[PDB]
Amino acid sequence: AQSVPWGISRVQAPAAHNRGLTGSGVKVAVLDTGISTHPDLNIRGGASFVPGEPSTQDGNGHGTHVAGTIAALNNSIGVLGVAPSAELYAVKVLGASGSGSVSSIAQGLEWAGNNGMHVANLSLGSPSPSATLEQAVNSATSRGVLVVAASGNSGAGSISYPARYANAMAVGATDQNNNRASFSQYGAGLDIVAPGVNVQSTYPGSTYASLNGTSMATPHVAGAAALVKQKNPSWSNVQIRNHLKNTATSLGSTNLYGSGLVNAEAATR
């Protein structure tokens, strides 16, 4: 039996699926620790920029979990992504320890724009800026990618980079009541929020696990973007981003929540 995680329901993804919108034909790059092969995932391809570790698969689990929130397959097992037909690409920019360099992340963003990705999910960040990172976000954006990135885990009232850059779409995390999660960074530059507490998804070893993080919020919006792209395949990154913000459920306090809670039903009418 397939379980629908509470966050997938809360963002109303199944309403999109019932309109025939599942992310089919939309290329989504997951810039993370890798993506493990898993019965409940379809990984179309990818690249690695982490020296000395295998170019495929995920020795941490983070990237596999994130991938499943975007695109766990719609079937009779496991979980269900926001965009279960999305074409997933595993772009390994963090090593098994879960950290990477500005270099590798930039190399991943270059790869994404050069390979025609429509959406790049970056469940990663740091509080401090980097011109190399900034230039890489701008690059992916220029080449047509919608860059979606986590606000960060510190709980404080500035958001992390690359999320904080204008051309990245910054995502914070809500809890099961839609209140800001205690670890969810907030402040100037936040675009939107999504579920990020007790988020069950795919994990290496053919299993499933629940995680807390802004890294778990992010893929809800990356998947919503894929839904909107399928419905409107000529729209730009910016048009998709703006539509997602405009159709979000306002939660007030934009310093905490940006434009509010991502709403896949409202985004795909």
Give binding residues as ranges: 2, 40, 73, 75, 77, 79, 163, 165, 168
Q: Which of residues 58-87 bind Ca ion (CB under 5 A)?
A: 72-73, 75, 78
**Hey, which residues does 199 pair with through a beta bridge?**
211
Task: Please say if 191 is a catalytic residue.
Answer: no
Nearer to Na ion, 170 or 248 (CB): 170
Nearer to Ca ion, 75 or 142 (CB): 75
Binding-site size, Ca ion (CB under 5 A): 6
CA separation, residue 53 to residues 31, 77, 91, 100, 155 (Å): 15, 30, 13, 12, 31
| CB 176 within 8 Å of CB 197 | yes
Nearer to Na ion, 60 or 141 (CB): 141
Q: Cα separation of 214 and 211, whole Å?
A: 10
Among 11, 31, 40, 93, binds Ca ion (CB under 5 A): 40
DSSP string, 42-108: -EEEEEE--TTS-SSS-SSSHHHHHHHHHH--SSSSS---SSTT-EEEEEE-B-TTS-B-HHHHHHH
Residues forming the annotated binding site for Ca(2+)? Answer: 2, 40, 73, 75, 77, 79, 163, 165, 168
Q: Provide, rounded to whole angstroms, the least separation between the CB of residue 166 and Na ion.
A: 6
DSSP string, 143-157: TT-EEEEE--SS-SS
Q: Which of 248, 265, 266 minimizes the C-alpha distance to 257?
A: 248
Q: Which residue is nearest to Ca ion (CB)?
A: 78
Binds 137, which of Na ion, Ca ion, none (CB < 5 to 8 A, cut-off by type)?
none
In the complex, the residues that contact Na ion under the rule CB under 5 A are 168, 170, 189
Binds 7, which of Na ion, Ca ion, none (CB < 5 to 8 A, cut-off by type)?
none
| CB 32 within 8 Å of CB 66 | yes
Amino acid in position 147 = V
Kindly report whether the peptide bond that precedes residue 162 is cis, defined as omega within 30 degrees of 0: yes
Binds 75, which of Ca ion, Na ion, none (CB < 5 to 8 A, cut-off by type)?
Ca ion
The residue from 104, 139, 160, 215 that is catalytic is: 215
Q: Provide, rounded to whole angstroms, the least separation between the CB of residue 161 and Na ion.
A: 9
Nearer to Na ion, 105 or 168 (CB): 168
Q: Which of 122, 123, 217 minimizes the C-alpha distance to 173?
A: 217
Task: Please say if 201 is a catalytic residue.
Answer: no
Q: Provide, rounded to whole angstroms, the least separation between the CB of residue 78 and Ca ion.
A: 4
Sign of CA dihedral 4, 40, 99, 191: negative
Nearer to Ca ion, 2 or 198 (CB): 2
The residue from 32, 36, 184, 201 that is catalytic is: 32
Task: Please say if 58 is a catalytic residue.
Answer: no
| CB 41 within 8 Å of CB 79 | no
Please tell me whether residue 88 binds Ca ion under the rule CB under 5 A: no
The residue from 62, 65, 220, 243 that is catalytic is: 62
Active-site residue set? 32, 62, 215
Interface with Ca ion (CB under 5 A): 2, 40, 72-73, 75, 78
